[PDB]
C-alpha cells in the first residue's frame, strides 16, 4: 500500500483552516492514523481510526475519509501547531507511513538582529577560526548573508544553519559561520558580515577588527 | 502514564550487528493489548516501519528488512531489543521503539536514537565560547569536530530555555560535524548572571561545562 500526501508543504497564517490530504494505493477502509512531528522530536499520535480524536489532543484537530481518500484538518491553525504530519495505515502488513505533509506559519515580515562574534583565544590556539554571524528572530527565512575580509568578497569558506520555525513567534534564526585557519585569520585585519533580508529597508553590516 | 526509551551504540561499522534496547519503565510489558515495535526515520527513506513483537515472543517483520532482523523481549527486565546485521550505509537513521495498540495505533514513542554507519571512530568535541560583544547581548557556544550525530546542548543545566537557539549541526570539510549555540540575554544580568552551556555528546561519553564570560 502506498500512500500519498498532498501537499509536500504549506505556509497559512494563524487561525486559518487547514486541510491536508493522504491518498492510499487500494481501499484501506478507516484503518488510517495521523501523526504530528516537531522538529527534533518523536511523532505524536492525533488522529487514530480515520476520525478519532486521541486523548487530550485539542479539539482543533479532526480527520475524516473512508477507501482511499482521507482527509486531516485544523480548524483554526495556532503558533504551536507547525510540524510535519504524516498518515499510516494498518490494513495489512507491512505498516506504511506517507511521506508527510510539512505545516509552516505566514507571520508578518520580522527583521533579524545582526551579532558578529570574533574567535575566542581558544579555539585560535586549537588552530582554527570561526567566526559567526547570528541573526535572530526573523521572518521569512529567506536571507542572504556575504563575508567581507578586508572588503573582499568570500566564496566557499563559509556555512550556514538555519534554526526550524519558531513555535511561539514563528521566526527563523540563522548562524553563519566563517571558517580559516589561524595562520590565515592572521593575515587579515576587518571582518564583515552583510545581511540582506526582507525585513531591512538596507543591507546591514556586522564588521569587528581582529583583536576587539 | 508509560515511557520508552531506547539504549545502544550510536556508532556501528559496516558488516557488524546493530543492538538496541528499549527499557519500558511505569508499566509492564505484558500485555496482550500492545504490540512492541521498532520504527525508523531517515532522510532518504522517510519513516519506516521495522518490526513488532508480542508479549509471547511472536513476531512480525517487514519484508525489505526481514533477513537482517532480529526482535527479541525480555518480560522480567520489562525491555525489547532489536538486532540488526549486516548493515548498511542505508542503515543510518534514528530508531524508536514504539508501543502500538493491538487496534493500529504507535501511542507512545521513544525519544529516538541516532544509529550512524561508519568505519570511523568516535571523537568528542571541544568546546569553545562565544564571548558577548556589547540592550540584549547575545552569547554563544561553539560545539565543534565530533562524531557522529547528535550532541545535545543546554544553559544552566535546563534553567536557562527563553532566548534559546540550537542551530542543526553543520558538516565540515573534515568529516566532522560541528554546533552552534546561542541565547540573548539583557545586558544589565551580564554581570551578576552567571551562563553556562552544558554540551552533551552520548556516542564518545562527552560532558563539558563551559563557562561564557564578558
Ligand atoms: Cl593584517
Ligand atoms: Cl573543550
Ligand atoms: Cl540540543
Known amino acids: 500500500i502506498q500512500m500519498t500526501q498532498s501537499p509536500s508543504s504549506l505556509s497559512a497564517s494563524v487561525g486559518d483552516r487547514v486541510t491536508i490530504t493522504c491518498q492510499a494505493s487500494q481501499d484501506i477502509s478507516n484503518y488510517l492514523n495521523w501523526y504530528q512531528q516537531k522538529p527534533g522530536k518523536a511523532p505524536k499520535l492525533l488522529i487514530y481510526?480515520?476520525?478519532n480524536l486521541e486523548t487530550g489532543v485539542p479539539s482543533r484537530f479532526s480527520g475524516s475519509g473512508s477507501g482511499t481518500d482521507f482527509t486531516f484538518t485544523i480548524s483554526s491553525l495556532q503558533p504551536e501547531d507547525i510540524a510535519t504530519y504524516f498518515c499510516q495505515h494498518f490494513d495489512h502488513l507491512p505498516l506504511a507511513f506517507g511521506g508527510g505533509t510539512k505545516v509552516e506559519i505566514k507571520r508578518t515580515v520580522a527583521a533579524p538582529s545582526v551579532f558578529i562574534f570574533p574567535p575566542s583565544d581558544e579555539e585560535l590556539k586549537s588552530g582554527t577560526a570561526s567566526v559567526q554571524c547570528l541573526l535572530n528572530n526573523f521572518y521569512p527565512r529567506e536571507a542572504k548573508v556575504q563575508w567581507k575580509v578586508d572588503n573582499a568578497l568570500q566564496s566557499g569558506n563559509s556555512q550556514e544553519s538555519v534554526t526550524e520555525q519558531d513555535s511561539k513567534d514563528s521566526t527563523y534564526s540563522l548562524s553563519s559561520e566563517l571558517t580559516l585557519s589561524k595562520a590565515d585569520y592572521e593575515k587579515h585585519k576587518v571582518y564583515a558580515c552583510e545581511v540582506t533580508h526582507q525585513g531591512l529597508s538596507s543591507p546591514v553590516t556586522k564588521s569587528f577588527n581582529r583583536g576587539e | 502514564q508509560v515511557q520508552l526509551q531506547e539504549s545502544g551504540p550510536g556508532l556501528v561499522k559496516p558488516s557488524e550487528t546493530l543492538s538496541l534496547t528499549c527499557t519500558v519503565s511505569?508499566?509492564?510489558?505484558?500485555?496482550?493489548?500492545?504490540?512492541w515495535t521498532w520504527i525508523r526515520q531517515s532522510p532518504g527513506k522517510g519513516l519506516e516501519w521495522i518490526g513488532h513483537?508480542?508479549?509471547?515472543?511472536?513476531?512480525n517483520y517487514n519484508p525489505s528488512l526481514k533477513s537482517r532482523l532480529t526482535i527479541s523481549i525480555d518480560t522480567s527486565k520489562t525491555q525489547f531489543s532489536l538486532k540488526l546485521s549486516s548493515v548498511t550505509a542505508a542503515d543510518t537513521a534514528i530508531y524508536y521503539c514504539?508501543?502500538?495498540?493491538?487496534?493500529?495505533?504507535?501511542?507512545?514513542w521513544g525519544q529516538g536514537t541516532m544509529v550512524t554507519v561508519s568505519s570511523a571512530s568516535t571523537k568528542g568535541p571541544s568546546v569553545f565560547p562565544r564571548a558577548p560583544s556589547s540592550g540584549t547581548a547575545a552569547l554563544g557556544c561553539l560545539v565543534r569536530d565530533y562524531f557522529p550525530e547528535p550532541v545535545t546542548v543546554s544553559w544552566n543545566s535546563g534553567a536557562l530555555t527563553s532566548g534559546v537557539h540550537t542551530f542543526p549541526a553543520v558538516l565540515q570539510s573534515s568529516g566532522l560535524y560541528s554546533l552552534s549555540s546561542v541565547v540573548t540575554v539583557p545586558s544589565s544580568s551580564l554581570g551578576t548572571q552567571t551562563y553556562i552551556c552544558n554540551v552533551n555528546h552520548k556516542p564518545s561519553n562527552t560532558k563539558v561545562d563551559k563557562k561564557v564570560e564578558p
Open positions: 511505569g508499566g509492564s510489558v505484558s500485555s496482550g493489548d500492545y504490540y
Open positions: 481510526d480515520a476520525s
Open positions: 514504539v508501543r502500538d495498540r493491538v487496534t493500529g495505533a504507535f501511542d507512545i
Open positions: 513483537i508480542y508479549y509471547s515472543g511472536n513476531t
